[PDB]
Structure formats: structure tokens, C-alpha cells
Amino acid sequence: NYIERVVSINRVSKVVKGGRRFSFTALVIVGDGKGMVGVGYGKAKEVPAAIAKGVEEARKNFFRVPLIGSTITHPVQGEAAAGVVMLRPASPGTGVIAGGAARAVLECAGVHDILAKSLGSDNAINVVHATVAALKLLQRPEEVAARRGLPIEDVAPAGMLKARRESEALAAAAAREGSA
RNA sequence: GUUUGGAGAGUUUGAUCCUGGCUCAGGACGAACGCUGGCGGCGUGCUUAACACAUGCAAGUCGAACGGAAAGGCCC
């Protein structure tokens, strides 16, 4: 099951000697809610065809979000095309505290608890791009440990190790219930 | 050491991105005004003229400091 959010529909227009030739653009976000998300921008003469092209471009651009539990690993600031988004991890229960465009990215990413603030341009297209830039700056503790050559207990905070442990237990629980 | 904690929307253009102001959704009050109005608990009430003030109260008490004797009391 893929969750699909249409963030914005924009009616654009070319000009010609005969008048204005209108077109539609759709910014579409597709994800599985398991830490995969893709962003697709589709444009066509009609709204449904624009959305459909957006869905396809999003699936072409699936990428993986490092998620410790139901939260991002560490605070990050992504900047793209004047868009600036700050992401901060939150404790369980906080919920998605995010603005409209960033909410669509993070919900489809399956982030359940996050604090997100937009600090630059309010243009939905560029806010989405900035949010993706931030999510690409997220690092896994496993990857930090390897890149540093140190063990995991040496590079990460004990409380993040703990939250890792419990999240692995719930993954095992779902595997037990699902294979039973 | 460390989680207990940040949401945005509209509006410059034929269309676009940016910059940038304006406006709105929240909360608060020693409040006022309009419509409406059942009860109780607990608070609270001149923000203006340190303007002017009828009337009654808001500082007395001690006979174990003292001479005394108007009111009571008791004794002729």
C-alpha cells in the first residue's frame, strides 16, 4: 500500500498570439510509511494527468530515511532553492509538528514524531525540496560508527541505543505475530 | 549531560522564482459594548478627575498613678 499526497495544484500558462494556453502542474509525494519517500512533479493539460505523471516521477525518486524508532536520528537543517527546513527529533507521542508541505513529506516517510519549522521561502515546491535535502543529511548511527572506525557504543548516546533496542523488539514482535 | 520542545495561509505576474511589506487563524485581560441568560463553589470590581466632597463611623484605654464625686450602686 502506497500513501499518496497531492501537495499543490498550480494552474500555469504559456502565452501565444491566440491567447493564453493553460496547463496544470501537480506536486505529488508517494511513500510506504516505512521510511521510503519519493517526490514527483508532474505537468499536463489536465489535473488527473498531471497527478498521474507526478506519481510516476515520485516512484522513480524513492529514497530511504534513517529512522531511529518512529523519529529521525538527529536534528538537521536542509536548504534548497531559498527553502530552509529545520527538522528536530521528538519523543514518542509528540506527533508530526510540521507545516503543510513538510507534513506531506514526513507522513509519507512514516515519521510519526518530529518537530519541523520552515524558515525560508514559503513556496511549496521549494519547501518540499528543502525537506528532502534535510532528510538526505540524516545519518544512521551504524554509518557513523563505520565511517569513524569506532564501536557503536562509542559514537552514539546511550538513550539512542536504548530507543534502538525497543524499536527492534517491536519489529521482532510484528514478525512473531505475522509469521504465527 | 538531553529530547517533553518551534505547523502555517492569502495577496505584486499572462505565467514563474526570489525579495519584501500588509492581513489572518492562537493565547491573555482589574475590561467595555451587542444579543442572550438557570444554579452553585472560589476569586474579583474607579484603569478616568492626587477632581470637589452632604452624613455616620475608621484610636483609644488605665480608679492597681491622682485629687475627686456629675451618673449608677449601697448605707443613713
Ligand SMILES: [Mg+2]
Ligand atoms: Mg520571507
Ligand SMILES: [Mg+2]
Ligand atoms: Mg486611582
